Design an enzyme around this catalytic site. Structure first.
Site, PDB file in Angstrom:
ATOM      1  N   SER A  25     -19.978   1.507  10.317  1.00  0.00           N
ATOM      2  CA  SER A  25     -18.610   2.010  10.463  1.00  0.00           C
ATOM      3  C   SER A  25     -17.994   1.669  11.810  1.00  0.00           C
ATOM      4  N   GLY A  76      -2.977  10.928   4.032  1.00  0.00           N
ATOM      5  CA  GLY A  76      -4.234  10.224   3.844  1.00  0.00           C
ATOM      6  C   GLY A  76      -4.099   9.129   2.814  1.00  0.00           C
ATOM      7  N   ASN A 122      -7.586  -4.206   4.318  1.00  0.00           N
ATOM      8  CA  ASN A 122      -8.221  -5.097   3.375  1.00  0.00           C
ATOM      9  C   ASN A 122      -9.410  -5.860   3.934  1.00  0.00           C
ATOM     10  N   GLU A 142     -10.991   4.515   3.462  1.00  0.00           N
ATOM     11  CA  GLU A 142     -10.561   3.160   3.142  1.00  0.00           C
ATOM     12  C   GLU A 142     -10.180   3.133   1.673  1.00  0.00           C
ATOM     13  N   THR A 154      -9.842   6.184  -1.575  1.00  0.00           N
ATOM     14  CA  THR A 154     -10.753   6.928  -2.437  1.00  0.00           C
ATOM     15  C   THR A 154     -11.074   6.142  -3.695  1.00  0.00           C
TER      16      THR A 154
HETATM   17  C1  LIG Z   1       0.418   2.346  -0.168  1.00  0.00           C
HETATM   18  C2  LIG Z   1      -0.421   3.224  -1.155  1.00  0.00           C
HETATM   19  C3  LIG Z   1      -0.741   4.550  -0.569  1.00  0.00           C
HETATM   20  C4  LIG Z   1       0.504   3.509  -2.363  1.00  0.00           C
HETATM   21  O1  LIG Z   1       1.935   3.709  -2.156  1.00  0.00           O
HETATM   22  P1  LIG Z   1       3.013   2.468  -2.449  1.00  0.00           P
HETATM   23  O2  LIG Z   1       4.460   3.134  -2.475  1.00  0.00           O
HETATM   24  O3  LIG Z   1       2.760   2.035  -3.929  1.00  0.00           O
HETATM   25  O4  LIG Z   1       3.087   1.244  -1.367  1.00  0.00           O
HETATM   26  P2  LIG Z   1       2.995  -0.385  -1.751  1.00  0.00           P
HETATM   27  O5  LIG Z   1       1.548  -0.774  -1.611  1.00  0.00           O
HETATM   28  O6  LIG Z   1       3.630  -0.659  -3.098  1.00  0.00           O
HETATM   29  O7  LIG Z   1       3.853  -1.120  -0.590  1.00  0.00           O
HETATM   30  C5  LIG Z   1       3.594  -1.117   0.830  1.00  0.00           C
HETATM   31  C6  LIG Z   1       3.499  -2.563   1.492  1.00  0.00           C
HETATM   32  O8  LIG Z   1       2.081  -2.740   1.665  1.00  0.00           O
HETATM   33  C7  LIG Z   1       1.601  -3.962   1.020  1.00  0.00           C
HETATM   34  N1  LIG Z   1       0.164  -3.842   0.523  1.00  0.00           N
HETATM   35  C8  LIG Z   1      -0.463  -3.074  -0.503  1.00  0.00           C
HETATM   36  N2  LIG Z   1      -1.762  -3.257  -0.616  1.00  0.00           N
HETATM   37  C9  LIG Z   1      -2.046  -4.173   0.359  1.00  0.00           C
HETATM   38  C10 LIG Z   1      -3.302  -4.857   0.827  1.00  0.00           C
HETATM   39  N3  LIG Z   1      -4.473  -4.608   0.267  1.00  0.00           N
HETATM   40  N4  LIG Z   1      -3.242  -5.861   1.981  1.00  0.00           N
HETATM   41  C11 LIG Z   1      -2.019  -6.182   2.639  1.00  0.00           C
HETATM   42  N5  LIG Z   1      -0.746  -5.528   2.211  1.00  0.00           N
HETATM   43  C12 LIG Z   1      -0.830  -4.573   1.103  1.00  0.00           C
HETATM   44  C13 LIG Z   1       2.665  -4.236  -0.064  1.00  0.00           C
HETATM   45  O9  LIG Z   1       2.613  -5.615  -0.557  1.00  0.00           O
HETATM   46  C14 LIG Z   1       3.996  -3.786   0.653  1.00  0.00           C
HETATM   47  O10 LIG Z   1       4.468  -4.831   1.606  1.00  0.00           O
HETATM   48  P3  LIG Z   1       5.747  -5.646   2.293  1.00  0.00           P
HETATM   49  O11 LIG Z   1       6.529  -6.343   1.152  1.00  0.00           O
HETATM   50  O12 LIG Z   1       5.065  -6.645   3.274  1.00  0.00           O
HETATM   51  O13 LIG Z   1       6.632  -4.586   3.035  1.00  0.00           O
HETATM   52  C15 LIG Z   1      -1.771   2.488  -1.576  1.00  0.00           C
HETATM   53  O14 LIG Z   1      -1.447   1.194  -2.166  1.00  0.00           O
HETATM   54  C16 LIG Z   1      -2.794   2.158  -0.349  1.00  0.00           C
HETATM   55  O15 LIG Z   1      -3.109   0.961  -0.118  1.00  0.00           O
HETATM   56  N6  LIG Z   1      -3.335   3.134   0.475  1.00  0.00           N
HETATM   57  C17 LIG Z   1      -4.234   4.121  -0.047  1.00  0.00           C
HETATM   58  C18 LIG Z   1      -4.893   4.887   1.092  1.00  0.00           C
HETATM   59  C19 LIG Z   1      -5.294   3.987   2.313  1.00  0.00           C
HETATM   60  O16 LIG Z   1      -4.859   2.758   2.263  1.00  0.00           O
HETATM   61  N7  LIG Z   1      -6.053   4.655   3.396  1.00  0.00           N
HETATM   62  C20 LIG Z   1      -6.569   3.953   4.551  1.00  0.00           C
HETATM   63  C21 LIG Z   1      -7.580   4.585   5.385  1.00  0.00           C
HETATM   64  S1  LIG Z   1      -8.248   4.048   6.996  1.00  0.00           S
HETATM   65  C22 LIG Z   1     -10.026   4.270   7.182  1.00  0.00           C
HETATM   66  O17 LIG Z   1     -10.536   4.770   6.161  1.00  0.00           O
HETATM   67  C23 LIG Z   1     -10.791   3.886   8.420  1.00  0.00           C
HETATM   68  C24 LIG Z   1     -12.268   3.777   8.221  1.00  0.00           C
HETATM   69  C25 LIG Z   1     -13.103   2.697   8.820  1.00  0.00           C
HETATM   70  N8  LIG Z   1     -14.499   2.847   8.902  1.00  0.00           N
HETATM   71  O18 LIG Z   1     -15.239   1.905   8.339  1.00  0.00           O
HETATM   72  O19 LIG Z   1     -15.044   3.829   9.501  1.00  0.00           O
HETATM   73  C1  LIG Z   2     -16.490   9.865   8.402  1.00  0.00           C
HETATM   74  C2  LIG Z   2     -15.031   9.625   8.137  1.00  0.00           C
HETATM   75  C3  LIG Z   2     -14.368   8.630   9.048  1.00  0.00           C
HETATM   76  C4  LIG Z   2     -12.912   8.314   8.897  1.00  0.00           C
HETATM   77  N1  LIG Z   2     -12.404   7.350   9.865  1.00  0.00           N
HETATM   78  C5  LIG Z   2     -11.053   7.008   9.839  1.00  0.00           C
HETATM   79  C6  LIG Z   2     -10.577   6.062  10.848  1.00  0.00           C
HETATM   80  O1  LIG Z   2     -11.233   5.513  11.717  1.00  0.00           O
HETATM   81  N2  LIG Z   2      -9.127   5.762  10.792  1.00  0.00           N
HETATM   82  C7  LIG Z   2      -8.136   6.300   9.847  1.00  0.00           C
HETATM   83  O2  LIG Z   2      -6.986   6.044   9.843  1.00  0.00           O
HETATM   84  N3  LIG Z   2      -8.643   7.213   8.868  1.00  0.00           N
HETATM   85  C8  LIG Z   2      -9.998   7.589   8.815  1.00  0.00           C
HETATM   86  N4  LIG Z   2     -10.565   8.571   7.807  1.00  0.00           N
HETATM   87  C9  LIG Z   2      -9.806   9.242   6.768  1.00  0.00           C
HETATM   88  C10 LIG Z   2      -9.643   8.370   5.565  1.00  0.00           C
HETATM   89  O3  LIG Z   2      -8.992   7.136   5.703  1.00  0.00           O
HETATM   90  C11 LIG Z   2      -8.813   9.353   4.640  1.00  0.00           C
HETATM   91  O4  LIG Z   2      -9.824  10.413   4.122  1.00  0.00           O
HETATM   92  C12 LIG Z   2      -8.436   8.697   3.248  1.00  0.00           C
HETATM   93  O5  LIG Z   2      -7.421   7.571   3.411  1.00  0.00           O
HETATM   94  C13 LIG Z   2      -7.640   9.708   2.431  1.00  0.00           C
HETATM   95  O6  LIG Z   2      -8.046  10.937   1.982  1.00  0.00           O
HETATM   96  P1  LIG Z   2      -7.714  12.357   2.559  1.00  0.00           P
HETATM   97  O7  LIG Z   2      -8.845  12.824   3.395  1.00  0.00           O
HETATM   98  O8  LIG Z   2      -6.394  12.497   3.177  1.00  0.00           O
HETATM   99  O9  LIG Z   2      -7.600  13.166   1.237  1.00  0.00           O
HETATM  100  P2  LIG Z   2      -6.524  12.973   0.100  1.00  0.00           P
HETATM  101  O10 LIG Z   2      -5.722  11.724   0.247  1.00  0.00           O
HETATM  102  O11 LIG Z   2      -5.749  14.242   0.223  1.00  0.00           O
HETATM  103  O12 LIG Z   2      -7.250  12.995  -1.317  1.00  0.00           O
HETATM  104  C14 LIG Z   2      -8.099  14.037  -1.800  1.00  0.00           C
HETATM  105  C15 LIG Z   2      -8.652  13.787  -3.248  1.00  0.00           C
HETATM  106  O13 LIG Z   2      -7.439  13.685  -4.006  1.00  0.00           O
HETATM  107  C16 LIG Z   2      -7.352  12.436  -4.706  1.00  0.00           C
HETATM  108  N5  LIG Z   2      -5.940  11.938  -4.757  1.00  0.00           N
HETATM  109  C17 LIG Z   2      -4.958  11.747  -3.767  1.00  0.00           C
HETATM  110  N6  LIG Z   2      -3.826  11.289  -4.206  1.00  0.00           N
HETATM  111  C18 LIG Z   2      -4.021  11.156  -5.537  1.00  0.00           C
HETATM  112  C19 LIG Z   2      -3.167  10.701  -6.676  1.00  0.00           C
HETATM  113  N7  LIG Z   2      -1.919  10.302  -6.494  1.00  0.00           N
HETATM  114  N8  LIG Z   2      -3.732  10.683  -8.083  1.00  0.00           N
HETATM  115  C20 LIG Z   2      -5.057  11.096  -8.366  1.00  0.00           C
HETATM  116  N9  LIG Z   2      -5.943  11.564  -7.265  1.00  0.00           N
HETATM  117  C21 LIG Z   2      -5.372  11.570  -5.926  1.00  0.00           C
HETATM  118  C22 LIG Z   2      -8.314  11.518  -3.944  1.00  0.00           C
HETATM  119  O14 LIG Z   2      -8.736  10.410  -4.758  1.00  0.00           O
HETATM  120  C23 LIG Z   2      -9.444  12.480  -3.477  1.00  0.00           C
HETATM  121  O15 LIG Z   2     -10.424  12.711  -4.576  1.00  0.00           O
HETATM  122  C24 LIG Z   2     -12.097   8.979   7.838  1.00  0.00           C
HETATM  123  C25 LIG Z   2     -12.749   9.983   6.893  1.00  0.00           C
HETATM  124  C26 LIG Z   2     -14.194  10.292   7.055  1.00  0.00           C
HETATM  125  C27 LIG Z   2     -14.470  11.300   5.990  1.00  0.00           C
END
Ligand SMILES: CC(C)(COP(=O)(O)OP(=O)(O)OC[C@H]1O[C@@H](n2cnc3c(N)ncnc32)[C@H](O)[C@@H]1OP(=O)(O)O)[C@@H](O)C(=O)NCCC(=O)NCCSC(=O)CCC[N+](=O)[O-]
Ligand SMILES: Cc1cc2nc3c(=O)[nH]c(=O)nc-3n(C[C@H](O)[C@H](O)[C@H](O)COP(=O)(O)OP(=O)(O)OC[C@H]3O[C@@H](n4cnc5c(N)ncnc54)[C@H](O)[C@@H]3O)c2cc1C
Ligand SMILES: CC(C)(COP(=O)(O)OP(=O)(O)OC[C@H]1O[C@@H](n2cnc3c(N)ncnc32)[C@H](O)[C@@H]1OP(=O)(O)O)[C@@H](O)C(=O)NCCC(=O)NCCSC(=O)CCC[N+](=O)[O-]
Ligand SMILES: CC(C)(COP(=O)(O)OP(=O)(O)OC[C@H]1O[C@@H](n2cnc3c(N)ncnc32)[C@H](O)[C@@H]1OP(=O)(O)O)[C@@H](O)C(=O)NCCC(=O)NCCSC(=O)CCC[N+](=O)[O-]
Ligand SMILES: CC(C)(COP(=O)(O)OP(=O)(O)OC[C@H]1O[C@@H](n2cnc3c(N)ncnc32)[C@H](O)[C@@H]1OP(=O)(O)O)[C@@H](O)C(=O)NCCC(=O)NCCSC(=O)CCC[N+](=O)[O-]
Ligand SMILES: Cc1cc2nc3c(=O)[nH]c(=O)nc-3n(C[C@H](O)[C@H](O)[C@H](O)COP(=O)(O)OP(=O)(O)OC[C@H]3O[C@@H](n4cnc5c(N)ncnc54)[C@H](O)[C@@H]3O)c2cc1C
Ligand SMILES: Cc1cc2nc3c(=O)[nH]c(=O)nc-3n(C[C@H](O)[C@H](O)[C@H](O)COP(=O)(O)OP(=O)(O)OC[C@H]3O[C@@H](n4cnc5c(N)ncnc54)[C@H](O)[C@@H]3O)c2cc1C
Ligand SMILES: Cc1cc2nc3c(=O)[nH]c(=O)nc-3n(C[C@H](O)[C@H](O)[C@H](O)COP(=O)(O)OP(=O)(O)OC[C@H]3O[C@@H](n4cnc5c(N)ncnc54)[C@H](O)[C@@H]3O)c2cc1C
EC number: 1.3.8.6
Lengths: 390, 390, 390, 390
Positions: B93, B139, B245, B368, B370
């Site tokens: 991570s 999130g 991505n 990254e 769910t």
């Molecule tokens: C955006 C969503 C929430 C859905 O809402 P939507 O209204 O449908 O948004 P849309 O996706 O329809 O539109 C938003 C714009 O985003 C673009 N898009 C979408 N997917 C991608 C990917 N994969 N790569 C590059 N660009 C992308 C899209 O083409 C649009 O672009 P422009 O034309 O350039 O402006 C969903 O698609 C999504 O991708 N996100 C879900 C949650 C998420 O992304 N969480 C991130 C967490 S960070 C983390 O976990 C850190 C941990 C690291 N670690 O290893 O410890």
């Molecule tokens: C160890 C750890 C490290 C992390 N590190 C980072 C980091 O470095 N940087 C960063 O930016 N973030 C980080 N995160 C957070 C992570 O990116 C967010 O948890 C994730 O994007 C979203 O979930 P949430 O916690 O907000 O819960 P939620 O988005 O509230 O979701 C909760 C539950 O509801 C469901 N759900 C949500 N929306 C819908 C829908 N429309 N339809 C059906 N089900 C739905 C989900 O699938 C899940 O089962 C970390 C989390 C952990 C646990």
């Protein structure tokens, strides 16, 4: 730039020949086979012509080099089975027996005389053949077969007694590849022909899977076989299993076509059908299902490709095939079943085809090694310890 | 000729460089990382040195071309994550954030000045960074973030207010890649450094997953950011998602190493442990499980390879990554869990590691994107209809 | 002291009457129904006599008090459906429509005149009836039906136009309980009889589920209905749903009989069939399956009992029924399917029956509310938030 | 009229006493136990007071008639375990050992002298006890234990040698119920007390399940036991298994409380937490999950009730308990895990409790018979053929 019909771009992994072959066959399957499946399945009718037709295209025993065979790649063979099964498993089943269970063993374990005498006829589809291994009391365990072949030192021949059941194509076959246990303990292969006195092959009735396929028994009442009809190359279960592995390989590809048809049908139905105002495809429950189908299909497709390449390299092991055959056949089943559930009431009508696929994949997941047997096989390889018996 | 450690011969698909890199890293992970994981996980300790060490090996941001980076293939990057995760997800991570969430965005959306100023420091591991996107109320839905960045026409700077939570590395980070919504409506990236007045990053407590990883918040109380610290290349969620991505790609590979460790541990335990006279590996129930683990791992491995190749070809689409990330993270979980069940009572002891993996994969399958969110993503692509909202 | 045929001793929870009724019916089902199912299913033949026969036994509409009805308990009604379904779902389907979809609504929402005129005929089985709700474009969503009933102030009657599809018994029915939307917006029930000008009910073809059951449409071309044929008690979807809930209750019990037949058949086959020397029942994989079947069946049985008791107490809620109907129909399916897989090749032969059950349960899990729809229903109750639409 | 907190109205199946007992205990658990669990689990602290407190309430060994015991019903005992486990499995574990593994065997297989001497002390919670059966090389197979007890004809005593591991409460126990194999071949029970020379019981370290519970070994180095400390009523594995069955019964109820807590927490979170504008509870994916949890919990609850009633009637068989223990423990696990996934990132924080439950149920599904072992048990009963060994 994402194409759901080919998520991981399988296409750019296929040679021009392979792609040509697939497209050519697909055309035949969609123009000639799909239009005759509804009623053929509904009324358990098997068009013998289908073998002659496929004989023309040169699809029968495609990996064989010579004797009127295309001599193509394992991958191409897989691509062919996939297009066939995309229509119906019954059809692909006939093509699997002909190619990997009849032509292959004759080719690999036969004498040149036998090869020259049969391979061309089989390839052209002038001879419908079958593979007789399973018996009423011997299925998952072939070392338990009761069909014995006695030797006649005088007449230089063997007399065969036994019964083979659940045999694909037997009812309307011309050549029979039968395996019996000998007095020396070894199990060899024998070539039988329709008309041999003592040989009968009645149809099996009441099938509710692979209905567009002919299935029957091979009853041998003192059938006398000349010595030149004994497959000189197979002296034990290694012979039949060698063939089985080539069949299972094609089945791994095959079922994916069946799955793909289900995914496409389900997807369209989700878009066209509407309830609660919007199209079914708008609901989260529906979408997740489509996602799971595509996911499993994709993993299977690229795994199959790899095996095909390893096979042509003489690097493919039996376990490898057990792994994909077991996986793909099981997953395919779930996909068909989800598809059926997604069409609702309509889903139980053969008019919509999915029900036919769900039922066919039932038998597919059973023959050529049951889902669990293939697991014990993988398990023996993984642990080095056998777990079939006690 | 079948090798359970590589069923479909992945090896012969790797270039000599790739193989060298993997083997080199694996050595480091097994000699330096594995021996410090038991207590680091048990007591939630994160060795900052690990980043410097990895900095030496040149594993940080390996796909970047220049600025002190190895400039290797996407496949090699995957092979690296797999060896790291084979030890612990917490470690992988940190390496994922550093490489795909900090270095990558700076590289792709930054100014040369920023690149020159940071990339080398990050690559050597002299700067531990983090990615701030998630917020307490944002999130799965980032278009709902509340962190606002106001512009100061006078001082040529922005004032940031907001809170980011669940951030990996924040507690002991030097550079912060933060995303806030602007007055123009667009969302840009800002580079913050420890010490900026108004910036604090407290540790999160009570984690029972990824314990050997540091996790905290990023609290911004009127933090003032110079204009030269604004990522000039990202003007909307496209920036953070682009980074996401690349991270998800590595995670798809990663979890497979975790699964592999579980399979190996389970297999050995089955051979060494004995009950009812024989080794556990002799029972059918145990063997089928081992079969299912290997099966799923294999499909995932070859799928990942393909994506890696398509990626280096600039042919990889977001959906493709969602497909493997979702699949592999879910399957990995089941494998860990089956492994845990197979060690019996011992399975709940970190002394046997499986429990640590089962718990880590819990968080991995969540961040990254769910498991379900990735399904709606695939579903939108498959049907062309969005189903996230009503 | 453990009996696998009744793990938790259901027996001692049944009153002497209930037990007598069950045993009496079981005798009829095994002596008269089981012997005619193989070919009736194979050739899609429905013996109209079956209704007259059941009419004699007084099993039709058994919970009704008076009008020639047994007036028994909800539990007894469940026990009856279970014995019927133990033979075939098609048969139980006819008995469910007759009892809970025709007799019940007439009884609960009809005028005494209607009751007196029909209830006795239906009870004796002199009138085969059907329930017309579903339409080509209205299934999971009944508030979308297109069948309109116009009022003729002059002739004191309504003219009905519409099409009902997938209707059980329609092809050979005498009485039709049809629901149409009125000009006032309400949806009422109408009683139609064979012979009414403009009314036709053709058979549906190509069914591969519930084949021993008659299914067709109800086409109404300006069919004129007298006012005295309007169910005076139902003014909205509450009427049809009230009936639906009584049908679903019986279906929850029913499918358990189907499952039980599969478990028994599988168990015996495991004992009689032998491979690798010993009986199949000796293998761990086989045994775990038998365990899972029995487990699920048992939980369902005792849950059904409870509901039956709560029902007779006027304490049963719609959700309660959705919960057991959804559960039992889904679980039953898996059991049938595992059973099929356990008989191997033989499993695909109707001669062994399991395949017939697997296919029947396919339609059962779909009608009277799909598996998922029943989940949204439970979900609305659990959260207080509807999720059927957007 | 539907109540999701009691779908099938369990309440009206409980006697006034039972209901009173439950409510009384629930109050204690919520006011005294819940507030000390966060840190007790986080830091592996076990409050010995908890036993004294429960001793006061008279919850220890509640089914025993006399000796200072409440002498309540099996159902009440189940209701108690459910309220306890609703807080934490670790706590319920201590109460299960005390009641069904220590007090019960002394009561059923002891001499009056032993009963008089211990039962009252245990009941008041003045003596923390433990059950020593499992050994490093003997778990699923107890007929493989290595702890031997030699007889000293002279001193009228036995000398015990052996090691018991994974023992609940051993580290801070006063009384030890140990089982060893004798020279006559039989296996008897021995009562040991802290302080006996040669007896030590060190803590086990690195647990990541049931952390708020004390677990250790029982090492016996020539420990000498007086004859009056030998359980005169148990001469073979029938003794320990008799006890095991009473413990497993309580565990079947217990885990349901744990599941219920998860369902409630998940449900609330779904209502309070919002993404994409609306509450999570509005999404179809979320709702189906809640439906599945409630469904499984309900089936388990009413099944448990039945068993409890059959038990008090001396009609409960070992298999019956294996059936519910196996079912409920497995299902409970899935519920906890789904719950964890539903809280997202927060789900991995003990601050939200679900993660604690998911981890506890891991050990629960393992001890007192693994999920699969209970299947072989059911299978032996169903087929009459044993499948534990080869
Ligand atoms: C955006 C969503 C929430 C859905 O809402 P939507 O209204 O449908 O948004 P849309 O996706 O329809 O539109 C938003 C714009 O985003 C673009 N898009 C979408 N997917 C991608 C990917 N994969 N790569 C590059 N660009 C992308 C899209 O083409 C649009 O672009 P422009 O034309 O350039 O402006 C969903 O698609 C999504 O991708 N996100 C879900 C949650 C998420 O992304 N969480 C991130 C967490 S960070 C983390 O976990 C850190 C941990 C690291 N670690 O290893 O410890
Ligand atoms: C160890 C750890 C490290 C992390 N590190 C980072 C980091 O470095 N940087 C960063 O930016 N973030 C980080 N995160 C957070 C992570 O990116 C967010 O948890 C994730 O994007 C979203 O979930 P949430 O916690 O907000 O819960 P939620 O988005 O509230 O979701 C909760 C539950 O509801 C469901 N759900 C949500 N929306 C819908 C829908 N429309 N339809 C059906 N089900 C739905 C989900 O699938 C899940 O089962 C970390 C989390 C952990 C646990
Ligand atoms: C043999 C088994 C039953 C298990 O018993 P075992 O005692 O453990 O036998 P062993 O397997 O240990 O030993 C027997 C010898 O067989 C060899 N073997 C095993 N697997 C293979 C494969 N895949 N390919 C080639 N050779 C193989 C093995 O190396 C030994 O060889 P030699 O040294 O050369 O003598 C099992 O492994 C197996 O393979 N069979 C399971 C059932 C089966 O094979 N049924 C076939 C059905 S035919 C059919 O379904 C037609 C349908 C076509 N259609 O499409 O319609
Ligand atoms: C109605 C729904 C589609 C969802 O849309 P909604 O907008 O949410 O409608 P609502 O449900 O919110 O409101 C409509 C009114 O209906 C009432 N209702 C709901 N459920 C029940 C039950 N179980 N019993 C009695 N009444 C009920 C509700 O209280 C309202 O009443 P009033 O105040 O009296 O006016 C859904 O809830 C539903 O129940 N139907 C799903 C599909 C279905 O019911 N199909 C029936 C098939 S028939 C068949 O399969 C024959 C087979 C027989 N056989 O055995 O062969
Ligand atoms: C015995 C087995 C291992 C299988 O081997 P087998 O060779 O088949 O033995 P058999 O079972 O065939 O024979 C042994 C004798 O035992 C009897 N038996 C079997 N089951 C029961 C039950 N449930 N109740 C009472 N008696 C029973 C049987 O009738 C025989 O009796 P007699 O005629 O009187 O002499 C298996 O059946 C079994 O029951 N054990 C599996 C593992 C196990 O029992 N582990 C216990 C763990 S202790 C624990 O987890 C403490 C945790 C508490 N907490 O909550 O923290
Ligand atoms: C449409 C159709 C076409 C067929 N065509 C042919 C053909 O052309 N040629 C030919 O030779 N054969 C053919 N067969 C038969 C097929 O090869 C056999 O069904 C298969 O090899 C073995 O299964 P079986 O029917 O004997 O059942 P069994 O081997 O008796 O197995 C029954 C069930 O028991 C399980 N089982 C068996 N042994 C074990 C064990 N040791 N441990 C755990 N579970 C076990 C199985 O997994 C399965 O669930 C066909 C079957 C069908 C249904
Ligand atoms: C043998 C047989 C006999 C029948 N007999 C009768 C009878 O006697 N009388 C009568 O009135 N009807 C009868 N029916 C029809 C039955 O009641 C309808 O099939 C059922 O109510 C609805 O499904 P549908 O066929 O319209 O498909 P749909 O309602 O279109 O549903 C198709 C698929 O989409 C899903 N779906 C629909 N809406 C949603 C949503 N909002 N969210 C997520 N998923 C959704 C379903 O769960 C299913 O998987 C019969 C059907 C069969 C197959
Ligand atoms: C928190 C905790 C508290 C405990 N407290 C106590 C206590 O107070 N008193 C006491 O006596 N014991 C106690 N135990 C131990 C428990 O009773 C043993 O774990 C259990 O009986 C047996 O498993 P095992 O650990 O020996 O593993 P094993 O028996 O070695 O089993 C390991 C895996 O192999 C499988 N397996 C074993 N045999 C077979 C077979 N023949 N076929 C197919 N699969 C098989 C199992 O199902 C499991 O998946 C405790 C354990 C934990 C984890």
């Amino acid at each position: 730039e994402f194409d759901w019909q080919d998520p991981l771009v399988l296409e750019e992994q296929l040679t021009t020949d392979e792609i040509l072959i697939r497209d050519t066959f697909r055309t035949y399957c969609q123009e000639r086979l799909m239009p005759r499946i509804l009623l053929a399945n509904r009324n358990e009718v098997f068009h013998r012509e289908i073998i002659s037709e496929m004989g023309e295209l040169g699809v029968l025993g495609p990996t064989i080099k010579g004797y009127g065979c295309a001599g193509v790649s394992s991958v191409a063979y897989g691509l062919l089975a996939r297009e066939l099964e995309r229509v119906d498993s019954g059809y692909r089943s006939a093509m699997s027996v002909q190619s990997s269970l009849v032509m292959h063993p004759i080719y690999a374990y036969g004498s040149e005389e036998q090869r020259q005498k049969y391979l061309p006829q089989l390839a052209k589809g002038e001879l419908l053949g079958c593979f007789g291994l399973t018996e009423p009391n011997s299925g998952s365990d072939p070392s338990s077969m009761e069909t014995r072949a006695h030797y006649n030192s005088s007449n230089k021949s063997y007399t065969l007694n036994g019964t083979k059941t659940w045999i694909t194509n037997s009812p309307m076959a011309d050549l029979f590849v039968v395996w019996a246990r000998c007095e020396d303990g070894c199990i060899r292969g024998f070539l039988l022909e329709k008309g041999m006195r003592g040989l009968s092959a009645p149809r099996i009735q009441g099938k509710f899977s692979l209905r567009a396929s002919a299935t029957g028994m091979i009853i041998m009442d003192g059938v006398e076989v000349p010595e030149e009809n004994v497959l000189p190359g197979a002296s034990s279960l290694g012979g039949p299993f060698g063939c089985l592995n080539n069949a299972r390989y094609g089945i791994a590809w095959g079922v994916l076509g069946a799955s793909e048809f289900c995914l496409h049908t389900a997807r369209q139905y989700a878009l066209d059908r509407m309830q609660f105002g919007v199209p079914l495809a708008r609901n989260q429950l529906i979408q997740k299902k489509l996602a799971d189908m595509l996911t499993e299909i994709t993993l299977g497709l690229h795994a199959c490709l790899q095996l095909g390449r390893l096979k042509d390299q003489d690097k493919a092991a039996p376990e490898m095939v057990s792994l994909l055959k077991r996986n793909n056949c099981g997953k395919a089943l779930d996909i068909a079943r989800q598809a059926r559930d997604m069409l609702g009431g309509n889903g139980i009508s053969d008019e919509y085809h999915v029900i036919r696929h769900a039922m066919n994949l039932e038998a597919v997941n059973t023959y050529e090694g049951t889902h669990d047997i293939h697991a014990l096989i993988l398990g023996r390889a993984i642990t080095g310890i056998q777990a079939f018996t006690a």
